[PDB]
Amino acid sequence: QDVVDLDFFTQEPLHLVSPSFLSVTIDANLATDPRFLILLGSPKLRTLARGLSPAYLRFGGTKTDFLIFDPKKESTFEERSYWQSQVNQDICKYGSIPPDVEEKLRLEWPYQEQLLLREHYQKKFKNSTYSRSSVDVLYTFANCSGLDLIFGLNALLRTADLQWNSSNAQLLLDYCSSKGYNISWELGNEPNSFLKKADIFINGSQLGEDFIQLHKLLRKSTFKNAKLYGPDVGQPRRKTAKMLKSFLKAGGEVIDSVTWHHYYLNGRTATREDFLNPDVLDIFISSVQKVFQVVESTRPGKKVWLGETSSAYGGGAPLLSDTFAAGFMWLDKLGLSARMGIEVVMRQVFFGAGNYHLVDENFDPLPDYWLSLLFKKLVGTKVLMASVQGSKRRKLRVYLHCTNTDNPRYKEGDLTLYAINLHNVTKYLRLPYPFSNKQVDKYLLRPLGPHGLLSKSVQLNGLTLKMVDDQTLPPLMEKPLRPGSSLGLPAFSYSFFVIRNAKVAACI
Ligand SMILES: *[C@@H]1O[C@H](CO[C@@H]2O[C@@H](C)[C@@H](O)[C@@H](O)[C@@H]2O)[C@@H](O[C@@H]2O[C@H](CO)[C@@H](O)[C@H](O)[C@H]2NC(C)=O)[C@H](O)[C@H]1NC(C)=O
Ligand SMILES: *[C@@H]1[C@H](O)[C@@H](O)[C@H](O)[C@@H](C(=O)O)[C@H]1NCCCCCCCCN=[N+]=[N-]
Numbered sequence: 001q002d003v004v005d006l007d008f009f010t011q012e013p014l015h016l017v018s019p020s021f022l023s024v025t026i027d028a029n030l031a032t033d034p035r036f037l038i039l040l041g042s043p044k045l046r047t048l049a050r051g052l053s054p055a056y057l058r059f060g061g062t063k064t065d066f067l068i069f070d071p072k073k074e075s076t077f078e079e080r081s082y083w084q085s086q087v088n089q090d091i092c093k094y095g096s097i098p099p100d101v102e103e104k105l106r107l108e109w110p111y112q113e114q115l116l117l118r119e120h121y122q123k124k125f126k127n128s129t130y131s132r133s134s135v136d137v138l139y140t141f142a143n144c145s146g147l148d149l150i151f152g153l154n155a156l157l158r159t160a161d162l163q164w165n166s167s168n169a170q171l172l173l174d175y176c177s178s179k180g181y182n183i184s185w186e187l188g189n190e191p192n193s194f195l196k197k198a199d200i201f202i203n204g205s206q207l208g209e210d211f212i213q214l215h216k217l218l219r220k221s222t223f224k225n226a227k228l229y230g231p232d233v234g235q236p237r238r239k240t241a242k243m244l245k246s247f248l249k250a251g252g253e254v255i256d257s258v259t260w261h262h263y264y265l266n267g268r269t270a271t272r273e274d275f276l277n278p279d280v281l282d283i284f285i286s287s288v289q290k291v292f293q294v295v296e297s298t299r300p301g302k303k304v305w306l307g308e309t310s311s312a313y314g315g316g317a318p319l320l321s322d323t324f325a326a327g328f329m330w331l332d333k334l335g336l337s338a339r340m341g342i343e344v345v346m347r348q349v350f351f352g353a354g355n356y357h358l359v360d361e362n363f364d365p366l367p368d369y370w371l372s373l374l375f376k377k378l379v380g381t382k383v384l385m386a387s388v389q390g391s392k393r394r395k396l397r398v399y400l401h402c403t404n405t406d407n408p409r410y411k412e413g414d415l416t417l418y419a420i421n422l423h424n425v426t427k428y429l430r431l432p433y434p435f436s437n438k439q440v441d442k443y444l445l446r447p448l449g450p451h452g453l454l455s456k457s458v459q460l461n462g463l464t465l466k467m468v469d470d471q472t473l474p475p476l477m478e479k480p481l482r483p484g485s486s487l488g489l490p491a492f493s494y495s496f497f498v499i500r501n502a503k504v505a506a507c508i
């Protein structure tokens with residue numbers, strides 16, 4: 001019997017996630033050679049980014065702590081040409097990359113990608129500078145795409161006695177003020193591994209003071225209510241958890257949210273079977289509980305954000321992280337994050353080096369992009385709860401929110417269920433009363449074509465998802481179900497279901 005009964009708990013929200021719950025990163029290493037930031041001038045890229053608004057865009061990564069703002073820095077042919085062609089035109093409406101520059105950067109990018117990826121497993125780590133032009137490219141991409149920029153500041157600029165030296169950051173904040181930029185900030189990326197990365201140990205207590213120091217500069221600036229997030233610690237292993245704890249004791253008062261990072265797997269060792277294994281899905285929970293214990297002990301009630309997360313570290317799992325099979329991890333992460341109290345989840349990455357990107361080297365969306373877009377259109381901010389009657393809840397995983405009321409097909413009271421089937425057979429879900437005789441819109445995602453779960457294309461209710469063109473996302477077409485039908489979920493698939501006229505009081 002492949003018929004599973006659902007229970008729903010709709011009396012009140014367990015949590016309220018941010019409208020920007022599904023957020024994204026651009027790795028700081030895209031600036032290592034800043035020419036490649038010009039790639040963000042693509043209209044195709046903007047079209048795609050806009051589909052994910054509202055969202056935070058976090059500019060940050062390992063390179064965060066090896067980047068230096070230099071207002072005097074000299075521009076390349078590519079940058080001068082990009083900027084010269086934007087003059088006298090509405091950059092958000094009409095901005096594009098000169099074709100010669102676009103072609104040059106697309107030719108160089110695979111090499112650049114290899115270089116950036118190898119800098120991971122390289123022992124050495126070098127400084128680079130970036131110009132005002134680089135900052136401008138990033139701001140305009142975020143602003144034009146309806147995204148909120150979070151900019152990670154370099155925490156390895158140090159005084160003689162290992163306090164954070166804030167003079168470079170001050171030059172940047174001055175520059176951003178003078179331009180009217182609405183930007184939020186971080187300081188440092190994964191400080192827990194600064195010893196490994198730079199021969200310098202900063203403890204959490206010291207990092208707290210560096211944050212307080214940065215806070216004082218943001219209170220002085222022309223944007224007095226600029227938000228500040230931190231500390232962007234890695235996976236909460238014991239040592240990292242202790243660093244977080246001491247950080248929150250010292251400087252937890254001045255952060256608007258606590259940021260930490262999570263990866264399921266090592267990209268070099270991950271298997272296809274790891275991507276489908278509910279034990280691998282379940283370990284994320286352990287991490288979440290350890291983070292909330294640390295936060296509850298030190299700053300109870302403080303918002304908790306996943307500041308950088310993906311399927312696998314090291315740039316992703318070759319041939320796995322860019323496939324339909326990557327969706328189980330992504331959707332389950334969002335599901336669990338929402339249900340356990342995480343307010344924002346920042347996907348590593350929207351675009352850039354690695355194959356855990358949502359959008360590839362050709363600016364084509366991968367299956368996780370479409371998964372993200374569907375999530376964004378259907379799933380509301382109020383998190384409710386669903387469960388499966390039985391003890392095989394490991395392989396049939398179910399989440400329930402109020403329906404996104406910005407969606408014009410639906411209304412207040414409506415419910416959005418999403419579910420993951422990791423069994424190797426079809427399962428059929430029975431909705432509970434009073435949702436057992438409603439019109440229900442199915443949104444089932446399945447891999448296209450011979451590679452199956454390892455495919456990089458996906459269908460929505462039997463229809464291939466593709467950009468209509470560079471300016472235009474397609475409609476996402478529902479499949480109406482017969483009222484009172486069970487909800488069919490094929491083997492190794494995931495789906496959304498919108499329960500229309502559900503009239504849930506909590507969703508109003
Ligand atoms: C398919 O999965 C089963 C385990 O899942 C159960 O059986 C499915 C057919 C379906 O009825 C699900 O809803 C069930 O939850 C695999 O069999 C297990 O394999 C493991 C690991 O090899 C073994 O240790 C267990 O003893 C097996 N359990 C059972 C109940 O048979 C089966 O091999 C899978 N089929 C494949 C990979 O083709
Ligand atoms: C986050 C980082 O900021 C990004 O710049 C990287 O591209 C990204 C990635 O690896 O893809 C990510 N780095 C996380 C590093 C993972 C550390 C875990 C190592 C565990 C080894 N344990 N021991 N001992």
Ligand SMILES: *[C@@H]1O[C@H](CO)[C@@H](O)[C@H](O)[C@H]1NC(C)=O
Pocket residue numbers: 125126127156157158
């Ligand atoms: C990077 O630059 C800063 C400031 O100039 C310096 O203190 C730091 O040691 C440099 N690190 C490397 C690896 O070059």
Ligand SMILES: *[C@@H]1O[C@H](CO)[C@@H](O)[C@H](O)[C@H]1NC(C)=O
Pocket residue numbers: 158159160165166167168
């Ligand atoms: C901080 O850095 C600036 C810019 O490099 C340097 O000129 C200044 O002396 C440093 N201050 C301290 C206290 O180290």
Ligand SMILES: *[C@@H]1O[C@H](CO)[C@@H](O)[C@H](O)[C@H]1NC(C)=O
Pocket residue numbers: 162203205206
């Ligand atoms: C943290 O670092 C400071 C100096 O930066 C040091 O004096 C202090 O003892 C350290 N505290 C702990 C708990 O390690």
